[PDB]
Amino acid sequence: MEKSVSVILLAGGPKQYIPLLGQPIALYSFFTFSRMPEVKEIVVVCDPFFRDIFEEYEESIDVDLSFAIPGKERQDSVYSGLQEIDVNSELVCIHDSARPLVNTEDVEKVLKDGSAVGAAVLGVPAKATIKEVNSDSLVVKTTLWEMQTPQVIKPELLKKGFELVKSEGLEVTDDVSIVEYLKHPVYVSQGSYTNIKVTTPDDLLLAERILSE
Amino acid sequence: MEKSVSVILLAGGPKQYIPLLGQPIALYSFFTFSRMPEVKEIVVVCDPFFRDIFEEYEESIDVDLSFAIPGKERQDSVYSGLQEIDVNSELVCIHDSARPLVNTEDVEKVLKDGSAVGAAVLGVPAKATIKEVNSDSLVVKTTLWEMQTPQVIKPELLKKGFELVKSEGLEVTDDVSIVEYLKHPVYVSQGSYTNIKVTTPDDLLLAERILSE
Ligand SMILES: Oc1c(Cl)cc(Cl)cc1-c1[nH]c(Br)c(Br)c1Br
Ligand SMILES: Oc1c(Cl)cc(Cl)cc1-c1[nH]c(Br)c(Br)c1Br
Ligand SMILES: [K+]
Ligand SMILES: [K+]
Ligand SMILES: [K+]
Ligand SMILES: [K+]
Ligand SMILES: [K+]
Ligand SMILES: [K+]
Ligand SMILES: [K+]
Numbered sequence: 554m555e556k557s558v559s560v561i562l563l564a565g566g567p568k569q570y571i572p573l574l575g576q577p578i579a580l581y582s583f584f585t586f587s588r589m590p591e592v593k594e595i596v597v598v599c600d601p602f603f604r605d606i607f608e609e610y611e612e613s614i615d616v617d618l619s620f621a622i623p624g625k626e627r628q629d630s631v632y633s634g635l636q637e638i639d640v641n642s643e644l645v646c647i648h649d650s651a652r653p654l655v656n657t658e659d660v661e662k663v664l665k666d667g668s669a670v671g672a673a674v675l676g677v678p679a680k681a682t683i684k685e686v687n688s689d690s691l692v693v694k695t696t697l698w699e700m701q702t703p704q705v706i707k708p709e710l711l712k713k714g715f716e717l718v719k720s721e722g723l724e725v726t727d728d729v730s731i732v733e734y735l736k737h738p739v740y741v742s743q744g745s746y747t748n749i750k751v752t753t754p755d756d757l758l759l760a761e762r763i764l765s766e
Numbered sequence: 767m768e769k770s771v772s773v774i775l776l777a778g779g780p781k782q783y784i785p786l787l788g789q790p791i792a793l794y795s796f797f798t799f800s801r802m803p804e805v806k807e808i809v810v811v812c813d814p815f816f817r818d819i820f821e822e823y824e825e826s827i828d829v830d831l832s833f834a835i836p837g838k839e840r841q842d843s844v845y846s847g848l849q850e851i852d853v854n855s856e857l858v859c860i861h862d863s864a865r866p867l868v869n870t871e872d873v874e875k876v877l878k879d880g881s882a883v884g885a886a887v888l889g890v891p892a893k894a895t896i897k898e899v900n901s902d903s904l905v906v907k908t909t910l911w912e913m914q915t916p917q918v919i920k921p922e923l924l925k926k927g928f929e930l931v932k933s934e935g936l937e938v939t940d941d942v943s944i945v946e947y948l949k950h951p952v953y954v955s956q957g958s959y960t961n962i963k964v965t966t967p968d969d970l971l972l973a974e975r976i977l978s979e
């Protein structure tokens with residue numbers, strides 16, 4: 554549906570403001586989402602200090618711009634952003650702003666899969682040789698995917714996830730997130746290797762090389 | 767033990783000959799192994815065209831230099847190299863020549879662990895969020911390590927591995943290697959993130975940055 558998706562853009566906690574070809578890293582996905590007709594609003598989660606970076610483009614973008622205060626951990630920032638979404642939003646699209654080069658086609662794909670399944674995340678096959686290791690440092694002998702963002706979830710599903718975690722006192726890590734505790738399926742939408750997270754100066758050189766084709 | 771280890775250096779199949787600060791990538795680990803008193807010999811697996819690259823330093827290095835012809839797949843190249851090792855070698859040290867920056871201290875560690883356990887491999891905790899995905903593209907809900915080289919194995923163990931694979935007609939992939947079929951334990955020696963494999967031009971820039979501290 555048109556104007557059905559609310560983006561929560563994680564830009565709080567800086568790496569995501571270091572420019573890439575003269576535009577702060579955070580603005581790349583911001584603009585990518587803003588041009589998509591499916592996207593109704595972008596809730597930016599950032600320190601108030603950096604609000605003007607997004608605010609300047611508010612009149613030029615075809616989305617509603619909203620803000621939310623960052624929390625202690627990533628999941629707290631998501632919860633904060635969630636409190637700001639349109640009451641009739643059909644899909645929440647959570648995105649790490651340190652991921653500038655997400656392609657429109659791949660956002661479309663994960664939105665569509667999220668709509669279909671209830672929860673979906675962009676992923677790529679893990680290129681490295683990865684093995685399970687037990688507590689004695691031995692290989693556990695017996696397909697693996699690297700997760701990216703967007704992570705797309707229906708709001709009612711996300712709300713119930715937060716409810717279950719707080720009422721039971723469950724532990725949330727980056728690996729064991731809200732969805733890991735739910736019995737609802739999570740689809741992995743096949744993305745592109747170009748959707749790297751930019752943290753080290755080595756990544757900026759790679760990101761420049763990708764934007765230059 | 768001194769002069770107990772035989773290195774099989776995989777340089778066949780080029781990325782491993784592109785210079786890093788003016789020295790061909792393959793020579794970095796070659797020299798690293800050559801200076802270690804534990805190392806008796808290096809069996810280089812490469813196309814005869816590139817033999818002179820290593821041969822030039824033969825009189826300057828404190829190891830025996832030997833050569834072997836590369837095979838179809840990685841495991842065939844290992845088998846070829848294995849046929850060349852000293853009959854009294856106590857440890858086989860298999861190394862991807864596309865890994866120039868392996869530290870001496872980490873080679874020492876994996877040699878020691880290989881000697882103790884029978885098989886050991888350098889590994890680092892996987893930094894990415896990695897998940898198991900089933901055939902329907904759904905996350906399988908429930909520690910993961912990225913494997914590097916050296917991969918260190920007692921020769922009698924490796925020989926038996928090759929025997930089991932050929933006599934049964936087992937399938938060998940990079941993930942499901944010789945050791946995966948054996949009941950003998952494989953230890954993961956904790957390495958350094960700097961032990962990257964150099965294949966893309968982006969890696970060369972990172973490798974230069976690492977050698978420059
Ligand atoms: O880890 C996730 C994955 Cl793999 C897929 C989806 Cl759809 C959502 C999450 C997630 N991440 C965070 Br932080 C929260 Br809150 C949630 Br829900
Ligand atoms: O994959 C491995 C690991 Cl994880 C540990 C060790 Cl010690 C050896 C191997 C290996 N790799 C290849 Br190719 C051969 Br042949 C063997 Br044996
Ligand atoms: K829009
Ligand atoms: K509105
Ligand atoms: K971005
Ligand atoms: K992408
Ligand atoms: K469908
Ligand atoms: K990206
Ligand atoms: K990185």
Ligand SMILES: [K+]
Pocket residue numbers: 799800801802803804805806828829
């Ligand atoms: K030596």
Ligand SMILES: [K+]
Pocket residue numbers: 830852
């Ligand atoms: K000898």
Ligand SMILES: [K+]
Pocket residue numbers: 791792793794795796862863864865866867
């Ligand atoms: K090397």
Ligand SMILES: [K+]
Pocket residue numbers: 867868869872873957958960961
């Ligand atoms: K190392």
Ligand SMILES: [K+]
Pocket residue numbers: 882
């Ligand atoms: K020991």
Ligand SMILES: [K+]
Pocket residue numbers: 864865866867868960961962963
């Ligand atoms: K390396």
Ligand SMILES: [K+]
Pocket residue numbers: 963965966969
């Ligand atoms: K690479």
